[PDB]
Amino acid sequence: MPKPINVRVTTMDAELEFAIQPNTTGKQLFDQVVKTIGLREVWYFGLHYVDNKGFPTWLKLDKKVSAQEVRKENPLQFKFRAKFYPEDVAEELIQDITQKLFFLQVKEGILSDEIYCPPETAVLLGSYAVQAKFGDYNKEVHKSGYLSSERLIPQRVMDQHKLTRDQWEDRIQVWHAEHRGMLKDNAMLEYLKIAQDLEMYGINYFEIKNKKGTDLWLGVDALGLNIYEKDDKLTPKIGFPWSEIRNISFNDKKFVIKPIDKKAPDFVFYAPRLRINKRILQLCMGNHELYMRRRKPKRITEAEKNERVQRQLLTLSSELSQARDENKRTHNDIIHNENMRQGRDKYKTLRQIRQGNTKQRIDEFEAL
Secondary structure (H helix, E strand, O other): OOEEEEEEEEEEOOOEEEEEEEOOOOHHHHHHHHHHOOOOOHEEEEHHHHOOOOOEEEOOOOOEEEOOEEOOOOOOEEEEOOOOOOHHHHHHHOOOOHHHHHHHHHHHHHHHOOOOHHHHHHHHHHHHHHHHHHHHHHHHHOOOOOOOOOOOOHHHHHOEEEEHOOOOOOOHHHHHHHHHOOOOHHHHHHHHHOOOHHHHHHHEEEEEEEOOOEEEEEEEEOOOOEEOOOOOOOOOOOOEEHHEEEEEEEOOEEOOOOOOOOOOOOOOEOOOHHHHHHHHHHHHHHHHHHHHHHOOOOOOOHHHHHHHHHHHHHHHHHHHOOEOHHHOOOOOHHHHHHHHOOOOOHHHHHHHHHOOOOOHHHHHHHHO
């Protein structure tokens, strides 16, 4: 008789465990997961794991699980996570559950400093996260030390100020108090609205080279493709929006991006590993497809569209500058600050780097 396969899948805040048959496909597994947690916006998510060669991988849904070399272990371990991000969370996300999972996943990336976040923004987000978890601030309940166990802000942010842990608690509490009245769902959504303007938000980075062999980063996201210089992941230098892209493919380390303008030249770049190249290609195709479905079935920051959030950031900057230990800032801080000095934000930069012809942009790519 067919022996059942034990599988364990974790979401950002839940653990699921069930048995599947040897002939179970990824789709069958996937559907069981989403059905259990009540999630229907399935297009964003996937089952992530690490195969028996130590490689991070997304499960194929049209393919039996016991055929994709998942580690021979009991149970099989999967992580249910977002593989794709909406273009604008405020316009797209529908379900509380979907919002929450995005919120948790993005927050994890901020707190671990995988996603760069400037001090004031980090503090504010942390205060929205507190609201999301504890609800309304209550002096009777949330006495001094109620945040002591919390991972509130990135460690980098603490290092560059003259505040102690105890003092950071105080700071966040104050802003927690400002959010009084905000429902937890709305807290999480506001968290995402702010986070999505971050330079590194929603971006997968990959090491690539141009013709002459310059080490560069490729950035793949919901908006299009970005090119970065090797030491600056915050500021893309060249951009191609999905709207200018017709087709993505690769062959032996050579990527070829075909244009919608048949008169334009192909965008061509190089990437070393085959395993990595596969995931690059999936991320491009998936993001490209979602982009199209939104359009045929000038972005501004949250701060600029939400005067209340704008005032909060500004007030934060005021409170913090007096505690700022400037010779303790990191490389990304310094980069972010120069960008700000130049009057840049995520969307102004994207418009800037998308200027000119395809040929023109392809040429400066090679010149890098």
